[PDB]
Symmetry: C2
Subunit: 295 residues, 2 copies
């Protein structure tokens, strides 16, 4: 296993015709290598998994692996709200060369704890690739509590959990019920430094899409226990921790990216839409404040 | 008239999708459900919506169920196909696969999980509607989708010719009035929350796409007719008999409880259900069985 520190939930850049832009995707992979990002999640929420059918999903992940050329672990998204669909997505990724897979809890259909367990057990049963669980009730309508996560630790290849609740007290609870070995990632930038400080292993983040160097410093300092340096680094980027959510992720981050020249176009698949004029000002300020160089 | 009456209104069942022991669709139970609803007077059937477990049926199996439900109905009862998706392309695809099935309308939940803005919601439904000429019914259920599509956004779709109304499940009955004042008197309003169905009709809604319909269609029908007719006494008297089910069918996420009930009836042959959903846990068996007795259901 041993993915940790600053993990970027990568956006999927699109051509103005709406197809995947592989030139920008390559630029982004090099960028995270050039700065010091520890891993790349390909096609999760931030990467717009909802709007990418399986064949496109497989392509973006597979291409990201190719561009990385072994220099950085790539983790592929394998979440679905049907167990059978998740298994199929998992099987189609089994030989792309991912280090791991990130699987969100089934959204919309609100299964019970027993069902989440059976769900993830059957998904993990269909692969040798390490699985990371992902709880985000703000999006899924289901809260997968630590008591539930703990019953999955014994599944050989379930290696940890991303938790986006922002509820920092869960770190202790998760440590207590799972082992020291189970990996705990934060999925809430606003509480991340704190999450690591309480004993988290790393952060699967939106903001390190656009401030990876500083986001790395913050994560490394926190893990080392240099709280002063962690807070110091957090200080400069904290503004983005709310600005990148003035409309749902990845609407703002993708605008911020195509703005810094990171990507060729700001195109986004429907039902998602490009960031409203209303927020252009707010986000340019938070961006200039994080020492991001426009234009 | 003008000319043969009935638009889709009144008491509509969000139909259960019955399964065989091996998880395939049970067509003989499906046909039995369709007869049952005809005999008992249900106004219309939504096939493969949430209660029909739409998330765990791939598009092929989805359209077979819709196609067969229409067929079993054989012109005796309107069938509404679910066409909800969180990607526009996927919902266009699903809509197109249902054109020419003999469906009276389609019902499409707002995009879930990905949380589009209102401008995105409009673009989504415009594009879905543009790809068909079957009537479309919008579906708002923030409890499951994590977007709340507000009245003011629904109003901007009223102009889109074949969008005919909205199912609202929030249980905010103040929205009937708001929606009326912004949409037509002609725009169809459906309650999606059984606990507030009666009140929703009484305030000016046109119908209820209900979960409890599955197991108490006669009294439910009675309740909806009466409230539509403005006869509050009979409606309330109808409601009182079955009100207990409006809480008890939600002790686990729908359709887990209703499926158990329908089997324990049993309208179906098997209570099997598809992962990640699981059969009702035994903890709630007594809870639901007694709620069913109080609503006049038998055997047992
Ligand atoms: Cl998020
Ligand atoms: Cl529910």
């Amino acid at each position: 296993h041993m993915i940790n520190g600053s993990i970027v939930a990568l956006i999927t850049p699109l051509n103005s015709d709406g197809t995947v832009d592989y030139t920008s995707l390559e630029k982004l992979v090099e960028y995270h290598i050039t700065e010091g990002t520890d891993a790349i999640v390909a096609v999760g929420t931030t990467g717009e998994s909802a709007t990418l059918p399986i064949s496109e999903h497989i392509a973006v992940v597979g291409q990201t692996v190719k561009f990385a050329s072994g220099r950085i672990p790539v983790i592929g998204g394998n979440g679905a709200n049907a167990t059978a669909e998740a298994i199929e997505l998992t099987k189609a990724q089994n030989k792309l060369g991912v280090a791991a897979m990130l699987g969100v809890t089934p959204y919309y259909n609100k299964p019970s704890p027993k069902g989440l367990i059976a769900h993830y057990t059957a998904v993990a049963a269909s692969t040798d690739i390490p699985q990371i669980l992902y709880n985000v009730p703000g999006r899924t309508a289901v809260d997968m509590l630590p008591e539930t996560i703990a019953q999955l630790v014994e599944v050989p290849n379930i290696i940890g959990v991303k938790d986006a609740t922002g509820d920092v007290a869960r770190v202790k609870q998760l440590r207590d019920l799972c082992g020291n070995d189970f990996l705990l990632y934060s999925g809430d930038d606003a509480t991340a430094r704190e999450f690591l400080t309480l004993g988290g292993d790393g952060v699967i983040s939106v903001a390190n899409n656009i401030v990876p160097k500083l986001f790395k410093l913050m994560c490394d300092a926190a893990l080392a226990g240099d709280t002063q340096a962690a807070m110091a680094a957090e200080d400069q980027i904290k503004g983005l921790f709310s600005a990148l959510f003035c409309e749902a992720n990845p609407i703002p981050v993708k605008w911020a990216a195509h703005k810094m020249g990171l990507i060729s176009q700001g195109d986004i698949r429907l039902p998602l839409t490009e960031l409203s004029t209303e927020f252009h000002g707010l986000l340019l300020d938070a961006m200039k404040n994080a020492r991001i160089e426009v234009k």
